[PDB]
Amino acid sequence: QKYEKLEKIYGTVFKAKNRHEIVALKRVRLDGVPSSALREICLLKELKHKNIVRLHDVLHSDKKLTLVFEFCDQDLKKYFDSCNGDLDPEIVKSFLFQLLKGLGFCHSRNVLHRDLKPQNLLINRNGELKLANFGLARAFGIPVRCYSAEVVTLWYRPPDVLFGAKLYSTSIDMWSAGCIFAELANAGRPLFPGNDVDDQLKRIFRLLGTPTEEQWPSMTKLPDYKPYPMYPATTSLVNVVPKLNATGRDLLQNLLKCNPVQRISAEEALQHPYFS
Amino acid sequence: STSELLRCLGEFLCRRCYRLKHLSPTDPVLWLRSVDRSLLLQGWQDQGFITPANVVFLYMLCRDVISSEVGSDHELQAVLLTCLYLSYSYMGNEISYPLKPFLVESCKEAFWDRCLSVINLMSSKMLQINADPHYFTQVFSDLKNES
Numbered sequence A: 001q002k003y004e005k006l007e008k009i010y011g012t013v014f015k016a017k018n019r020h021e022i023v024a025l026k027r028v029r030l031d032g033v034p035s036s037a038l039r040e041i042c043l044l045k046e047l048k049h050k051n052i053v054r055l056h057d058v059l060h061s062d063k064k065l066t067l068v069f070e071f072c073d074q075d076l077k078k079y080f081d082s083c084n085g086d087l088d089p090e091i092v093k094s095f096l097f098q099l100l101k102g103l104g105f106c107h108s109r110n111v112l113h114r115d116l117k118p119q120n121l122l123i124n125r126n127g128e129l130k131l132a133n134f135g136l137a138r139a140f141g142i143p144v145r146c147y148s149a150e151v152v153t154l155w156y157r158p159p160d161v162l163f164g165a166k167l168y169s170t171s172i173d174m175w176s177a178g179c180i181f182a183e184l185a186n187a188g189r190p191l192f193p194g195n196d197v198d199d200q201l202k203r204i205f206r207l208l209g210t211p212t213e214e215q216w217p218s219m220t221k222l223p224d225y226k227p228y229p230m231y232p233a234t235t236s237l238v239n240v241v242p243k244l245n246a247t248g249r250d251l252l253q254n255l256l257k258c259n260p261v262q263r264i265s266a267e268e269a270l271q272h273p274y275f276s
Numbered sequence B: 001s002t003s004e005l006l007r008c009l010g011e012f013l014c015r016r017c018y019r020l021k022h023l024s025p026t027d028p029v030l031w032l033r034s035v036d037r038s039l040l041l042q043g044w045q046d047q048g049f050i051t052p053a054n055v056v057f058l059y060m061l062c063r064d065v066i067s068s069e070v071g072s073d074h075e076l077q078a079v080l081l082t083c084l085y086l087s088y089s090y091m092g093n094e095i096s097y098p099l100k101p102f103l104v105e106s107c108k109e110a111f112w113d114r115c116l117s118v119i120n121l122m123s124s125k126m127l128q129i130n131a132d133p134h135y136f137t138q139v140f141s142d143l144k145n146e147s
C-alpha cells in the first residue's frame, strides 16, 4: 500500500505510481478466480524475458491480492484503433518477431499460454511488444491423461480444440499466433470472428479447406468431431492478407495448419525467410 | 499406484511431525481423499485430481513446507490443505478450483499468507519438476523410499 493509484484502465488493471516509477496493478478479490491468479504469479516469477510482461511484486492487504506489473502504454487492440486501417509491413514484421520471441521463450521453459489474442499483447511507445495475462497458462511436461478443452478465446481457438481435444502441445499457441499474424497484416480485424463453436469451424474450413482423413488421420477420434461439408481449400490466402508478401503468406499458412502436428513451432518460425 | 504413494506421504508426515505420535499414516490420506471426493459436485471437476504424479508434486511441496515442530493435527491439516490447494491451482486438469473444501482454519487471512509464502519459496521447483524429468524421477524415488 505504498502505490499511489491513478486512472482505472479475471481481475482489474489500474495505472498507478509509486514514489518515480509508473506501474500497472491487478487487484484480485479473495472473497476459482484466486486459484487462477495464484498460478499466474507462480509462472511469471520464473519467466523473465524482454517480451513477457514483468511481475515486480505481490501484495496482500484487506482481502485483496495486488499484483504489481510493469506498465505498457497500450494493448494491441487499442494500438489497432490508434493507427487506423494500416500497419507498415516493417511493424507487422517487428511485432510478429517479438511475439514469437516471447512465445518461443515460454515454450522452451515448458509453459503454454493458452489465451493468445490481441488484448493479451502489450505495446510500449518504444514499439516493444510483451505477452501478458497468464491466468489461463500452465506448465507442462509430466505425463498427464489430459488437460482442459475450456481454453483460448473462441476466435483464436484451433480446430482440434474446437473438436473437443483435451490433449495438446505447444502447437495450440502457434494457431493463435497465426490468427494474430493475419490481423496484423490485414487491417487489424479478426480472421475468423465466429458466433459459436459450430460457426467458427465453418469459417476456418471455408477458407482453409475441410481437412481430409488423409491430412489428419486421428481427427475422427476427437470427442467432439463432426464431419463438415468438404469445402474448397483456397490456398491462395492472398485475398485475406493482401499486404503480405509471398514469403509472409508461406509462414502464415504454416502457422494455420488444421492438424496440430503440421503447425510450425516458434523456434522454426523465427528461422523463416520472412524474417531477416 | 496412487494407493501406495498416498501411504508413503502419510508415512512421511508422521516421520516429519514427531510431535504428533497419535498420528496414523491413514488420517492424512483421509483428509486428501475427502476434498477430492466432494469436488465431484458436478462443475468443480469431472475427474479425480489425485494421481501418482500429483501426489509426487504434493509431496514435493510438503517436504519443504511442513515444519517438524507442527503443534496439532488441526494445524497440520491446515498447511497440508494449503499445499493441496496450490497443487490443484498449478497442476489441475481444470482451469480453476474453489476455496471451500481447502479452508479449515478460522482466520482466512492466514490461509492466503501461507499461499504466498509457499509460492515465494517453491515457484522454481514447481516448474522444474515439470520441465526436468530427472528431477521428477528423483522426487518420485524419495517418496517411494519414505515407506
Ligand SMILES: O=C1Nc2ccccc2/C1=C1/Nc2ccccc2/C1=N\O
Binding pocket: A009, A013, A023, A024, A026, A053, A069, A070, A071, A072, A073, A074, A075, A078, A119, A122, A132, A133
Ligand atoms: O500496462 C499494463 N501492464 C499490464 C500487466 C498485465 C496485464 C495487462 C497490463 C497492462 C495494460 N496497459 C494497458 C494500456 C491500455 C489498454 C490496455 C492495457 C493493459 N492491459 O489490457
